[PDB]
Design a protein around this nucleic acid. Sequence first.
DNA 1: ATGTGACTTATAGTCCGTGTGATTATAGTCAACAT
DNA 2: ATGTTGACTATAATCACACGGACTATAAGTCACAT
Lengths: 76, 77, 77, 76
Amino acid sequence: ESFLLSKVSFVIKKIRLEKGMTQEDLAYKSNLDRTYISGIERNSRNLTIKSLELIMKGLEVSDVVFFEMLIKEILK
Amino acid sequence: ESFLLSKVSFVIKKIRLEKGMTQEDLAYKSNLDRTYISGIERNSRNLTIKSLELIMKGLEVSDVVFFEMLIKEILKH
Amino acid sequence: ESFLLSKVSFVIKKIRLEKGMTQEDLAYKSNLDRTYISGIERNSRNLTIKSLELIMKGLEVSDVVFFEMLIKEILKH
Amino acid sequence: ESFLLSKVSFVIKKIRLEKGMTQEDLAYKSNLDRTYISGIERNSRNLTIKSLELIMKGLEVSDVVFFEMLIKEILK
DNA sequence: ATGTGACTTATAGTCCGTGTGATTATAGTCAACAT
DNA sequence: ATGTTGACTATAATCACACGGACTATAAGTCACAT
């Protein structure tokens, strides 16, 4: 697997939780598949930017906040 | 098309020129086709995080540094 | 345009495919531009004996056997 | 300089002589410059196929006969 | 609720080639004077 | 006759790039069945 990919996924999971969402609800909100999301969170998926963008919409988080977070997460 | 993509697209080119690289050099070190590097910069193609990671390694730049410039380009007017 | 040129350009391609090479290998091995190899085959282009020699070295072929295949191509109907 | 380019030039000179032609006449017959011809024969020019072709027409020699000769000259 | 697996279908990514403006090196062509 | 030296100017040859079609790998999106 990839280092970045795991932290993207970790971040996605982090934010979903800090907000109190279920996967079911992140899937609904972003108009994507729930198993799709589960896959990403166990990090069994290699998103495209577009997909990442949809997940950010679903999380209701701007690109900037996401990347600010991803950076922090990246530095152990 | 996509907001984030053209930003990612823009930043890949910006860095590449800042480092005096050519598409040929880049696609070189990213072990992607020079067609793909062109494709990305040209028509903001929808790359995968893994591919983006390869390009970062190609640009001889870190995850962090890239995303910090990404944030800057998004914030601009 | 020129009789001999399209014969030369035909034979460069023939050999290139016979040896299972691609254009951009040959462009490397011949120590000429990517687009020049294309341009020679694609249209014809008016190359120099020195450049022709480089290509022959690149096709991994001798002056002699090149010209022998050149003669054969000229002689065709 | 180049081996091939030398043998080419030598051949051009050879054929010119076996036909009893002067350079002046070889240049008239192919409409090129006499100093141009001179230059090739003293191996100071790297001609293009197009030019080579004009010289063959000026020598009144077919492409095939030229290369047949060029091959033989190439083999010592 | 979340996590599998496995199975299509869209598309990301590859591979080989075409065609092009802009710049640099050099062949094409023609002087003057040689011998 | 041929040789040589500068020249000017056409174009060979370079360099960075765009663009397309066809093919291969894989992400996108949806089932069934776990827990």
